[PDB]
Design a binder for these strands. Structure first.
Ligand code: MG
Ligand code: MG
Ligand code: MG
Ligand code: MG
Ligand code: MG
Ligand code: MG
Ligand code: MG
Ligand code: MG
Ligand code: MG
Ligand code: MG
Ligand code: MG
Ligand code: MG
Ligand code: MG
Ligand code: MG
Ligand code: MG
Ligand code: MG
Ligand code: MG
Ligand code: MG
Ligand code: MG
Ligand code: MG
Lengths: 266, 155, 232
RNA sequence: AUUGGGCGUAAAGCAAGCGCAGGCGGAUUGAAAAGUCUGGUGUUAAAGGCAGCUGCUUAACAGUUGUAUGCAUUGGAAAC
RNA sequence: GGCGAAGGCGAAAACUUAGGCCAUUACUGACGCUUAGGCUUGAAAGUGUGGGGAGCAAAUAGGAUUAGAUACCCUAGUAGUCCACACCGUAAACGAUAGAUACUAGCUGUCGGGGCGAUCCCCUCGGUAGUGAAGUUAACACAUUAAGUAUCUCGCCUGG
RNA sequence: GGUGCAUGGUUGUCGUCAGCUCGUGUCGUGAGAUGUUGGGUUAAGUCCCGCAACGAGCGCAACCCUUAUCGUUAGUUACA
RNA sequence: CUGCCGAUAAGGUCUUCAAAA
């Protein structure tokens, strides 16, 4: 099968956020509450939702669709998406999601075309570049690469979106919804289920659960593309992953003191 | 053959540090006279550019319309702000007894016989909003069959 | 605010002089200066259906040389060189029989991207009761298709016979007016309408001159051939 | 604005309370039948109203046949 | 933050006295909601009679400021502000939101009763606040204490 | 000769101040908002970051002239 | 760190238009 239920439990993919932070519309995936203070999930629903999303992304990638991965959250997730990009040639946006990356694709298409033309000009080289002008063009290459280095490949609107957090990527999910493009996401108890299509009940704060699930969707794409899998359809010894540095791991949401009353009074 | 007809051409203006920036706003209704109709409002410094942008916006948002015997199936009240537009089924022959913005929408949608009365405001955008809202809330006599488990409208 | 004449700001740096002569004395510097204006005005006022873009004058102690560029030189040439003799007599009366003339028509290339004939065509359209919005747009689109940079057209006057004067501009692209290295060609014309006078100003951008020099090189006459004759 | 409107900021919630008459009002059973529904009969003058036809050269018009609304009485229905 | 229907209520004590919340294996058995007319209460100013008068201060006098100052500032200063008994019955008397009844996500506080028993904290039943989606609105905004989905009753509105 | 309150053309002024807008997109029933506002740096909307905005045009800056050092060409009518 | 500080005759333009290229 795809994964093992014990493995999900040991990776902490059945633990959401503090009960104070939850959208009441997400009650279907959170089994009746109890003394847990991080809102646990139904493991059967997790596997069922994951399998459905796996099947769909595989169908798209087999039929030569273009999927775009968008994670602009914690640093770890950024490096994760870059690693997934290395494994599979999927377009990615690790930096901030530009307004209208999909709905006003023409202007960003002009920008990425300019990036490619500048890249080949620099590669073709000339002694006219000298020192000052060469540095200016190189610095321009760096900026359009930092913000378009993963979008350069595609030439047409993607056929699918994978979002790490629908709450943080509200702009990305809104663009996908207005253009009627499938979007999958790892909801974490604080998301509106209406916006997402293939919901995948999961965590989003643990640097282990995220990586396991993110690689799993990447694993579907790699099998459809005919390159060997990484985490899917795999035994215990090869799924093992480590907890990043910098008793048990603490998925508690705190830092509430950084939310005072909006400045008022007179 | 998506025909288009201006329903209003207002003259909006803002104030700057000396003078008045004046821009024309157009309200175009586009319809194929077969079941597809949309509306688009745009602003520009000149009427031609405003019309082009309004038609582009109107063609971007096209809704689907169903007709029954050329008319509207059941009487409906479309609400949008303070504008309330009443639509009523009509026998084949009366023609479109509508007038103004509502009349333009009904003709561009395809409907023939239709009874209308504007019970609220006379602002073209809200009347069109109300008309489209009334037509979009309509229930076919086949959707309720799947819902109520009847016999494809049969008594 | 007020702007310095675009042509006049670029004279003696990147643009040559339309008249190149050195007179003998301060009395002969005035005669030789009004006379060439008459010749240029003659070419421009009448003989307009030819699209004359620029007329240059070259004079020595006593020998007058005229270089006339046009888009349609058939009207100047006439039927088997008829109208041509007429204009020669015109030129001779203005300067004098005692001198030697060497008039030279020279057909022009890339007629579109020239602010003179565009202004003349604009002025003709306004005088012909053509709607102003449509007239500028057709001229703008044809000029851009000709393969040039941005064009700026300002048409101020008693617009459409109105009693309150207005002004309509239409820039479409980079028109760097503050830049000296740019090649901006400027011309102004007076459309004589039944309700008054219409002023049309055309700014055209024809690239960047990256070769230093007070021109001495043609400008938008090179692309196609440029010859014909009537000289000696 | 019964059908067919409103009362925070546009006209309009009495300063608040105790409150008779009036209006409205929990659930179940029985009877009566005042409301309610329905059948029969009488009547609601004629002209006009709407439909058809005739006659004026067609019409306007005239005539012609059809065409309701309510009330009373009597015989049933029992859900509110 | 608490109480009262509203106006209002804050040194301490005694007497008299009103309503309210929670749990009820008890009792009566629709006796309930609203309310034209009627009655009761109703901030401050004001009135009538008799006391009281420390402070303050309408009216008034003077000194300033000012083109002028019958005003803002300052020094004086009567009625009044206080008590008892009689009236007046008006306020931005405002939550600018009549009362009653049933239903409709959630989160954070705080107060009272009850359950457990160091507090703290958990649950239940209510009062008082903030944030907030469906829903409503012309918009601001309201949003389980509705301006939401509905019913009953009363009062009121119809351009300046 | 009249009408600069019918105009063309030219000019003063804010002001050589750093501004004024447009295309596409998004929000708002709408006028409209966004970009152009936040944080740093400048003479500057100059630039860099942030950012439902992404870009572009005019202005700003540089390219033009002149003064300040030196090299090269030339040496009279300069110098000598 | 609270000086002082009052007034401004009447009526008026300006958007012509998208039919369209
Ligand atoms: Mg100002
Ligand atoms: Mg009303
Ligand atoms: Mg009021
Ligand atoms: Mg009240
Ligand atoms: Mg009141
Ligand atoms: Mg009571
Ligand atoms: Mg009673
Ligand atoms: Mg009768
Ligand atoms: Mg008759
Ligand atoms: Mg008092
Ligand atoms: Mg006095
Ligand atoms: Mg005193
Ligand atoms: Mg007194
Ligand atoms: Mg009152
Ligand atoms: Mg609120
Ligand atoms: Mg009146
Ligand atoms: Mg003037
Ligand atoms: Mg911003
Ligand atoms: Mg910015
Ligand atoms: Mg003073």
């Amino acid at each position: 099968e795809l994964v093992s239920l014990a493995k999900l439990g040991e990776m902490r993919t059945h633990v959401g956020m503090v009960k104070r932070y939850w959208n009441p519309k997400m009650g279907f995936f959170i089994e009746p509450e109890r003394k847990h203070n991080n809102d646990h999930f139904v493991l059967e629903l997790q596997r069922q939702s994951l399998q459905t999303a796996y099947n769909y992304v595989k169908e798209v990638a087999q039929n030569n669709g273009q999927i775009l991965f968008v994670g602009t959250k914690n640093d770890y997730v950024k490096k994760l998406v870059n690693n997934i990009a290395k494994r599979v040639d999927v377009a990615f946006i690790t930096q901030r999601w530009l307004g209208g990356t999909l709905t006003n694709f023409k202007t960003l298409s002009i920008s990425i075309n300019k990036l490619n033309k500048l890249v080949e000009k620099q590669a073709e080289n000339a002694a006219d570049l000298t020192k000052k002008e060469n540095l200016m063009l190189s610095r321009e290459i760096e900026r359009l690469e930092k913000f378009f280095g993963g979008v350069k490949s595609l030439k047409r609107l993607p056929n699918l979106l994978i979002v790490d957090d629908p709450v943080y990527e509200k702009n990305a999910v809104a663009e996908a919804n207005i253009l009627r493009i499938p979007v999958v996401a790892l909801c974490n108890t604080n998301t509106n289920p209406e916006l997402v299509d293939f919901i995948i009940p999961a965590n989003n704060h643990q640097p282990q659960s995220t990586c396991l699930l993110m690689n799993l969707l990447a694993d579907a794409v790699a099998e459809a593309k005919a390159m060997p899998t990484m985490f899917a359809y795999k035994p215990d010894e090869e799924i093992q992953i480590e907890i990043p540095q910098k008793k048990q791991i603490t998925s508690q949401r705190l830092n509430i003191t950084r939310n005072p009353e909006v400045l008022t009074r007179e | 053959e998506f025909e288009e007809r201006i329903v209003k051409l207002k003259r909006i203006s803002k104030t700057t540090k000396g003078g008045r920036n004046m821009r024309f706003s157009v309200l175009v209704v586009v319809g194929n006279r077969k079941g597809k109709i949309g509306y688009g409002i745009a602003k520009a410094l000149e009427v031609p550019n405003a019309i082009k942008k309004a038609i582009k916006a109107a063609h971007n948002s096209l809704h689907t319309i169903e007709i029954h015997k050329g008319s509207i199936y059941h009487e409906v009240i479309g609400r949008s702000g303070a504008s309330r537009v009443l639509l009523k089924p009509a026998p084949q022959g009366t023609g479109i007894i509508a007038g103004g913005a509502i009349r333009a929408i009904i003709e561009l949608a395809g409907y023939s016989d239709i009874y209308t009365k504007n019970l609220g405001r006379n602002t073209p955008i809200n009347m069109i909003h109300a008309t489209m809202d009334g037509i979009l809330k309509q229930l076919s006599p086949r959707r309720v069959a799947i819902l109520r488990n009847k016999n494809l409208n049969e008594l | 605010g007020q702007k310095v004449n675009s042509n006049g700001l670029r004279f003696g740096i990147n643009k040559n002089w339309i008249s190149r002569w050195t007179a003998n004395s301060h009395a002969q510097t005035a005669k030789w200066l009004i006379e060439d204006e008459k010749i240029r005005n003659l070419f421009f006022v009448n003989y307009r259906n030819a699209q004359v873009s620029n007329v240059e004058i070259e004079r020595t102690q006593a020998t007058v040389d005229v270089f006339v560029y046009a888009a349609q030189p058939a009207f100047l040439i006439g039927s088997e060189n008829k109208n041509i003799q007429k204009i020669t007599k015109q030129i001779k009366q203005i300067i004098g029989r005692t001198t030697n003339l060497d008039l030279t028509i020279n057909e022009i290339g890339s007629p579109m991207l020239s602010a003179r004939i565009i202004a003349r065509d604009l002025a003709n359209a306004i005088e012909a009761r053509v709607p102003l919005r449509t007239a500028m747009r057709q001229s703008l689109i044809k000029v851009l298709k000709a393969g040039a940079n941005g064009i700026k057209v300002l048409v101020s006057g008693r617009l459409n016979g109105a009693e309150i004067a207005r002004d309509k501009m239409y820039i479409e692209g980079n028109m760097p007016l503050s830049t000296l290295r740019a090649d901006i060609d400027y011309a102004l014309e007076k459309a004589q309408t039944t309700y008054g006078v219409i002023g049309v100003k055309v700014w055209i951008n024809r690239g960047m001159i990256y070769t230093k020099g007070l021109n001495r090189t043609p400008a938008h006459i090179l692309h196609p051939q440029k010859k014909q004759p009537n000289r000696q």
